[PDB]
Write a protein that binds this ligand. Sequence first.
Ligand SMILES: CC(C)[C@@H]1NCCc2ccc(NC(=O)c3ccc4cc(C(=N)N)ccc4c3)cc21
Length: 245
Amino acid sequence: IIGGEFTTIENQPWFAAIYRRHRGGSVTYVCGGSLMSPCWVISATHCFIDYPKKEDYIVYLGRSRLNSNTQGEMKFEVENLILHKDYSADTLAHHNDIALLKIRSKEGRCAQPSRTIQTICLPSMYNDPQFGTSCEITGFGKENSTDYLYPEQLKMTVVKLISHRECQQPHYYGSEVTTKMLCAADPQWKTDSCQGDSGGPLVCSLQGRMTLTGIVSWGRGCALKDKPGVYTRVSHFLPWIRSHT
Ligand SMILES: CC(C)[C@@H]1NCCc2ccc(NC(=O)c3ccc4cc(C(=N)N)ccc4c3)cc21
């Protein structure tokens, strides 16, 4: 996150920290995720497309720092890694960038809800918050575009949803942004998600209930003028999630 505020997992019960083991033994952070149901996590396909082995991943819940085992956390493994069957990556835009990771602990059980481990509701058919709505994003991603290390503590920030016609203007993303994607950004371009945040939650309070409306996907740079952050429009993929879970 660029700018924003430092927060602790208690505020983001449904945020999943996804890691990956390397030959030799080191473990680096990869991407974020959202707790769908006790046994499922949803993220982005571009965080696993290159190393499609369910065995190389680790998924943490209730973890507040990168190199610390926060009180009440749970360590998991990927029982099933399902990727959208039509994914492609262009110069900027990423298509069908949605993914399902069916988690499972060494003992064979799924997540166990608590004060620090919760789930968010999926959006419903054709019901997306209007443009200009404020929503939050979370991740252990960069705090600057020139840093190579991630913040040791979880961060969060708020942005505003941008209409589709406004995201297709020449000085924005032209025809690169498609109707199955959403755009969000700070009207002052000082705060925004960035590299390391991909796959993470974009939560909008829709008609009372906190809804998972977007999945961090792509964007030109981080917090750059007229260059919003593009997210995966969950509502569109409901039939996919349902039939695939
Ligand atoms: C190491 C890297 C090149 C990695 N390789 C596997 C394929 C692949 C695909 C996309 C990405 N994505 C990013 O690095 C990446 C970089 C910047 C991003 C910026 C925003 C945003 N400005 N809100 C929103 C999302 C962003 C995602 C990384 C990789």
